[PDB]
From a paper:
Here, we report FAMIN as a prototype of a new family of multifunctional purine enzymes conserved from bacteria to man. FAMIN and its prokaryotic orthologs additionally have adenosine deaminase, purine nucleoside phosphorylase, and S-methyl-5′-thioadenosine phosphorylase activity, hence, combine activities of the namesake enzymes of central purine metabolism. Consistent with DUF152 containing all enzymatic activity, recombinantly expressed DUF152 bacterial proteins YlmD and YfiH metabolized adenosine to inosine and adenine, MTA to adenine, and inosine to hypoxanthine. Crystal structures of several bacterial DUF152 proteins have been determined and revealed a monomeric α/β/α fold (Kim et al., 2006).
The His47 side chain inserted into the purine-binding pocket in apo-YlmD (semi-transparent representation). The His47 side chain may act as a gatekeeper of the active site that rotates outward when the substrate binds. Atypical laccase activity has been ascribed to some bacterial DUF152 proteins based on a spectrophotometric method that monitors the oxidation of proxy substrates (Beloqui et al., 2006). In this method, YlmD, YfiH, and FAMIN254I, in contrast to a conventional laccase, elicited only minuscule signals. In a sensitive LC-MS method (Perna et al., 2018), laccase end-products were only detected with a conventional laccase but not with YlmD, YfiH, or FAMIN254I.
Author numbering: 2 to 271
The structure:
Amino acid sequence: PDIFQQEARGWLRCGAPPFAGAVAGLTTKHGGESKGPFASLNMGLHVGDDRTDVVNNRRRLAEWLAFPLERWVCCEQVHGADIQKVTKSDRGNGAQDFATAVPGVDGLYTDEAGVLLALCFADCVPIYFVAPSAGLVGLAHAGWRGTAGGIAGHMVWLWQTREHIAPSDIYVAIGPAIGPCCYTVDDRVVDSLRPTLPPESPLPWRETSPGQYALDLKEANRLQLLAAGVPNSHIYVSERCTSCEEALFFSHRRDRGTTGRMLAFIGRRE
Ligand SMILES: [Zn+2]
Ligand SMILES: [Zn+2]
């Protein structure tokens, strides 16, 4: 069974055992207030939807999780590889007004309880991190650009060098994202990813016609995490494709660029 399992409402819980001490999951597209291409549980404030509808969708998740919206922390998600540590003093940033989101970063982490890290997705890879003994949680957004920038390994490096956590103490869930079944890219994308993988590494793409590659970004990020020292048995990977599973997910690719966003979230209850 997939590591992300359907709950009673419009969300999937991360069921990997090391995440049992955390509130961790990904929303699905149903149960909200938004309309048209955003129907209905659009969590993204940056996609041209009605802000009142989106805030109400966020308040609905907050009720399902018993984790108030005033305790969430969001980031700008610029498709880079930068990451910021956040604390209770950052609560609310980007929760109801996109302009207050943490600027210039694509991942967040915290060692405090009572802080819900909250990032938006509709094909890019959500990477959830936990160090259960040390009380750290993290969440990163990795499309091809962030993966080429090594965002996954950057989280591990920060936890090692700034938080004094060995990679062997980290566990990771790679959530629903677009699969190689649906994601075809050109030489420039794969050429950007090549230097981020070990020289002996199997390549997470297949050339399906000249200059066209079926790309597996989940696997690219898993390989980077392995190279950064996270143990194989600590990395859980969802098999759900956001483009294929149209009944559950918004997909930037399938929906031709105008669609909602799911929210990936992780935090610990205070
Ligand atoms: Zn993205
Ligand atoms: Zn697919």
